[PDB]
C-alpha cells in the first residue's frame, strides 16, 4: 500500500524499487505580454527517477519541444512522465526491472498504472512521506545538464557519489534527503554551507564535495540547524 514512516526500511531491502518524482517535468516562467496579459514560457525539465538502495539516478531530460502546440500541459506532463518511466523499464534487462515504483505525487498513479498495464507484477505505490526531491534542480550539475540540453536526452548519475564505500544505503538516503530538504527551505544558505571552504572540491565525476567522515558530521549538523531556524521563522514559534 502507501509508503509511510512505519514501512520505511523496506526501501533498503533487496527488492529493486524506484522513486518517480514529476515535480520538474513541466517548468514555466510567467511574464506579461505587450498588451498586458499574462503568458507562460516553458523551460527544459526532468523526470527524477531514483533507486534508493544503490543511488543510481535516471535523469530523463524533458526538452521544451515536447510541449509544442499542445493543450492542457500540466495534465499532459503526468502522462509524458508515465510514458517515459514505462519506456525506461522496457529498456532494462528483466533482472534489472523494478518490483515496485513509488510515485511522489498521487496524481501519477492512474497514468503510470495505465502505461504499465504490460507489467502487472510491478506494483505502483503512493507515499505519505513529504520527500524533497523537487530540490534536485538545486544540485548545480543536474540543473546545468538540463538547461543546456538541445534534444531529449537521458543522463545517468550516482546521486550518492562514492558514499556507499563507507556507509549504508539507509544512512546514504538520510544524508541525501537532509541535504535536499535544506536546499529546498533556503537554497542560498544551503549552498553557502556546502561550498564555503575552497579546499574541499567536487570530483569531476561527482555531484557533492569530497568531505571526510568528520567533515560530513559538521555539514549534517549545519544543515539540521538551517532547517530548524527556517521553521521558527515560518511559523513564529
Amino acid at each position: 500500500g502507501a509508503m509511510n514512516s512505519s514501512n520505511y526500511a523496506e526501501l533498503f531491502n533487496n527488492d529493486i524499487k524506484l522513486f518517480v518524482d514529476d515535480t520538474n517535468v513541466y517548468r514555466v516562467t510567467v511574464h506579461k505580454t505587450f498588451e498586458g496579459n499574462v503568458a507562460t514560457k516553458a523551460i527544459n525539465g526532468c523526470i527524477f527517477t531514483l533507486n534508493p538502495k544503490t543511488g543510481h539516478l535516471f535523469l530523463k531530460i524533458i526538452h521544451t519541444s515536447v510541449w509544442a502546440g499542445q493543450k492542457r500541459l500540466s495534465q499532459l506532463a503526468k502522462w509524458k512522465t508515465a510514458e517515459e518511466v514505462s519506456a525506461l523499464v522496457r529498456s532494462l534487462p528483466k533482472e534489472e526491472q523494478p518490483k515496485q515504483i513509488i510515485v511522489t505525487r498521487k496524481a501519477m498513479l492512474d497514468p503510470l498504472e495505465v502505461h504499465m498495464l504490460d507489467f502487472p507484477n510491478i506494483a505502483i505505490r503512493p507515499t505519505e512521506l513529504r520527500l524533497p526531491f523537487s530540490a534536485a534542480m538545486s544540485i548545480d550539475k543536474l540543473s546545468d545538464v538540463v538547461m543546456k540540453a538541445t534534444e531529449p536526452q537521458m543522463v545517468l548519475f550516482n546521486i550518492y557519489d562514492d558514499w556507499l564505500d563507507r556507509i549504508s544505503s539507509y544512512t546514504a538516503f538520510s544524508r541525501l534527503t537532509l541535504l535536499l530538504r535544506a536546499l529546498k527551505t533556503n537554497e542560498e544558505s544551503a549552498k553557502m554551507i556546502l561550498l564555503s571552504d575552497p579546499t574541499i572540491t567536487i570530483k569531476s565525476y561527482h555531484l557533492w564535495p569530497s568531505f571526510t567522515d568528520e567533515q560530513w558530521i559538521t555539514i549534517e549538523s549545519q544543515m539540521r540547524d538551517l532547517i530548524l531556524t527556517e521553521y521558527g521563522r515560518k511559523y513564529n514559534v
Binding site: 502522462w79 495505465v114 498495464l117
Partner: protein
C-alpha cells in the same frame, strides 16, 4: 392476461410482483396472482416475515410457459416451477379464480412505469447472465456475487454480467493510453457496442436488469454493474444521439422508482456527480438531472 397460481402459503411472507407487494399471513388461503400483463418480463419475489435478510425472486415471461409457486419445507423457500400439462394447469387456474383466492396485478391504465423500467430487457438475455438452462425462469437473490467480483467462488450461482474495467488492456489501446483513458469512446463503441453487445438495446437491457436486481434484492454487484455501464457512456466524448436521449429516459424512471429511504447504498456519489456535472455528457441528461436535484440534492 396471464396467471401464476400458488399451491399454498405455509409461511408468513411479503410477496412482490414487479413494483407491487402484498403481505400474506401464515396459512392464509392465497393461491396466486392473475391479470399479469403479457408482453414484458416480470419478477415475483419474496421476503419471509422471520428472515428480513435474503430477499429472493424469479424472473419470467408468461409467453414461455405456465409457471406456478410452491413452498418447499426442506429447502425453506417459495420455489417457481413449470407445469407442462396444459389442461391440468388451466383447471387449477380456473378453480382458484372461481373461488376468488387470487390477487389481481394492480396496474393503473395511465401507468407506463413497468414498461419504462423493462423496455430493453429480454428473457433470453437474462438466461445468459443467470445460467440455469433446465428452467425457463431465473432465480436471483440478495447474496449472489458477480463474475467480476469472483475474480477479486461458486460459478453455478454467479451473475455473468459483462466485465467492464477502465484500467485494463481491453479498454486502453497501446499508444493511445492517455487518449483512451480520458475519452472512453473507443471502449464504448468499438469494444463494447460493436464487439460484445452488438447493439445498444442489449447494452441498455443489461443496464436495466442490473438496476432492477439492485433495487429488488439489494444485490451489491448488480449495483456496481449499473453504475459502471452508466459511467462508460457519460465518459465517452462520442455517443450516438439516440442513445443519449434514450439513456436520459431510462435513468429518469429508475431514479423515479427507487425507494426514497435506500438512496444511500444504491446511489454512488462519485459516479453521479461525475456524470451529471463533469463528464462529456453533463448536458445531455436534463430529465435525469432535474429529478436528482429535486429529490436527492443531499447526494450532490
Amino acid at each position: 392476461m396471464n396467471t401464476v397460481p400458488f399451491t399454498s402459503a405455509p409461511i408468513e411472507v411479503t410477496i412482490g410482483i414487479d413494483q407491487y407487494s402484498f403481505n400474506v399471513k401464515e396459512n392464509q388461503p392465497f393461491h396466486g396472482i392473475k391479470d399479469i400483463p403479457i408482453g414484458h418480463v416480470h419478477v415475483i419475489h419474496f421476503q419471509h416475515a422471520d428472515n428480513s435478510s435474503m430477499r429472493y425472486g424469479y424472473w419470467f415471461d408468461c409467453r414461455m410457459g405456465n409457471f406456478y409457486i410452491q413452498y418447499d419445507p426442506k429447502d425453506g423457500l417459495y420455489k417457481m416451477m413449470e407445469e407442462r400439462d396444459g389442461a391440468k394447469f388451466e383447471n387449477i387456474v380456473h378453480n382458484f379464480k372461481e373461488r376468488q383466492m387470487m390477487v389481481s396485478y394492480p396496474k393503473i391504465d395511465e401507468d407506463d412505469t413497468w414498461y419504462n423500467l423493462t423496455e430493453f430487457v429480454q428473457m433470453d438475455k437474462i438466461r445468459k447472465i443467470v445460467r440455469k438452462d433446465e428452467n425457463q425462469f431465473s432465480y436471483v437473490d440478495s447474496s449472489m456475487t458477480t463474475v467480476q467480483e469472483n475474480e477479486l467462488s461458486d460459478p453455478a450461482h454467479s451473475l455473468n454480467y459483462t466485465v467492464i474495467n477502465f484500467k485494463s488492456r481491453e479498454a486502453i489501446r497501446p499508444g493511445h493510453e492517455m487518449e483512451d483513458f480520458l475519452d472512453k469512446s473507443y471502449y464504448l463503441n468499438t469494444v463494447m457496442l460493436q464487439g460484445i453487445f452488438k447493439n445498444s438495446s442489449n447494452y441498455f437491457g443489461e443496464l436495466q436488469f442490473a438496476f432492477l436486481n439492485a433495487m429488488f434484492f439489494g444485490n451489491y454487484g448488480s449495483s456496481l454493474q449499473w453504475h459502471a455501464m452508466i459511467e462508460l457512456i457519460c465518459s465517452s466524448a462520442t455517443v450516438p444521439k439516440h442513445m443519449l436521449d434514450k439513456l436520459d429516459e431510462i435513468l429518469y424512471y429508475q431514479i423515479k422508482t427507487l425507494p426514497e429511504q435506500y438512496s444511500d447504498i444504491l446511489l454512488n456519489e462519485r459516479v453521479w456527480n461525475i456524470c451529471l456535472y463533469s463528464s462529456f455528457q453533463k448536458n445531455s441528461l436534463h430529465n435525469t438531472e432535474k429529478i436528482m436535484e429535486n429529490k436527492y440534492p443531499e447526494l450532490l
